[PDB]
Amino acid sequence: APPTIQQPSMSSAVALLGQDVDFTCIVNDLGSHMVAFVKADSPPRLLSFDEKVFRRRNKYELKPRIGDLHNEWVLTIKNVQESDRGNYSCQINTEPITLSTGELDVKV
Amino acid sequence: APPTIQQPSMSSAVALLGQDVDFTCIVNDLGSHMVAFVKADSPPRLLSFDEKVFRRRNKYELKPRIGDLHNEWVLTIKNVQESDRGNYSCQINTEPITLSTGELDVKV
Ligand SMILES: *[C@@H]1O[C@H](CO)[C@@H](O)[C@H](O)[C@H]1NC(C)=O
Ligand SMILES: *[C@@H]1O[C@H](CO)[C@@H](O)[C@H](O)[C@H]1NC(C)=O
């Protein structure tokens, strides 16, 4: 079986300023494939690769390979701000690609 | 010194269908920081992380840490197609971030 993303994954969310929000990507049959979290933006921002956050460890947290099956990948956006509004995706390096996207709406 | 991107890096380019095109990111003072190449799209696509292409090794090639200074990172897009049009960025996990973007125009 190829990797698939179990649903619900990457559910859209809303938040007030300062609230913490999680996006969860649950991957079935990941095997040796890699998971990356990205924010859609111009330019986009890599947020995590495999088991490590790319940068800003106090802003983004990644709990990779958790859950009962070691197959839940939870990205936390801490202290949400207006600049965090937008679309977050988790993507797996399959051919063809496998991905799931959800929106963060920020209320002031 | 923090990482910086030497200019010219990530120069815009044009191509006919089937042509190969390179984007080069030349990083001064990279240290232990990581380089990622991303395509802006909805959703964006991670193309490479550190020294390895994310996926589609026959489509994207990465020559990481080449040049005289071992500080040129060259991403090749092989066999350019209409779907390859858009903005390619290299980004380094500094705080704050360091990045450079160039456009690929595809002619039919
Ligand atoms: C996120 O993507 C949806 C399409 O799935 C789009 O309608 C929405 O505007 C995007 N959110 C942004 C750009 O903040
Ligand atoms: C790439 O980004 C530039 C802004 O720097 C924008 O004008 C252009 O439309 C983009 N190219 C696309 C979306 O193909």
CATH number at residue A19: 2.60.40.10
How far is A50 from A45, CA to CA, in rounded Å?
15
- The finding on whether B103 has its CB within 6 A of some atom of ligand 2 is yes
Residue whose pair of structure tokens reads 């066999």 in the numeric block: B79
Task: Pinpoint the alpha helices (H) of chain A.
Answer: none
Q: Is the CB of B87 under 6 A from ligand 2?
A: yes
Phi-psi region of A100 (alpha: psi -120 to 50; beta: other; left: phi over 0): beta
Strands A21-28 and A4-5, by their bridges, are antiparallel
Residue that is written with structure tokens 């960025």 in the block = B89
Torsion of CA B102, A40, A37, A26, to 10 degrees: -140
| CA–CA gap between residue A6 and residue A28 (Å, rounded) | 6
A86 lines ligand 1 (CB under 6 A): yes
- Please, which residues bridge with residue B59 across strands? none
Q: Show the CA angle centred on residue B10, arms to residues B6 and B15, nearest 5°.
A: 150
Reported resolution in A?
A: 1.4
Shortest alpha-carbon distance between residue B25 and chain A (Å): 15
Contact of B27 with B1, CB cutoff 8 Å: no
Find chain B residues with C-beta within 8 A of A54's C-beta.
34, 36, 93
Domain total in chain A: 1
Whole-angstrom Cα distance, residue B75 to residue B73? 7
| Residues A14, A77 contacting (CB under 8 angstroms) | no
- Tokens 């240290």: give the residue: B31
d(CA A92, CA A98): 5
DSSP of B39-92: E-SSS-EEEEETTEESS-TTTEEEEEEETTTT-EEEEEE-S--GGG-EEEEEEE
What residue of A is the nearest CA neighbor of B49? A49
Q: What is the DSSP letter of A1?
A: -
Tokens 């390096």 label which residue? A93
| Angstrom distances, CA of residue B78 to CA of B11, B14, B18, B53, B86 | 17, 13, 7, 13, 15
Distance CA A10, CA A74 (A): 9
Other beta carbons less than 10 A from residue B85's beta carbon: 15
- CB contacts < 8 Å between A and B, how many? 68
- What single DSSP character describes residue A52? E
Range of the domain at A96: 1-108
Closest-CA distance of chain A to residue B76, Å: 18
Searching chain A, which residue's CA lies closest to the CA of residue B38?
A: A44
**β-bridge mates for residue A91, sequence order:** A36, A99
Which one-letter amino acid corresponds to residue A18?
G
CA A40 to chain B, closest CA, distance in angstroms equals 6
Q: Per DSSP, what are the bridge partners of residue B22?
A: B76
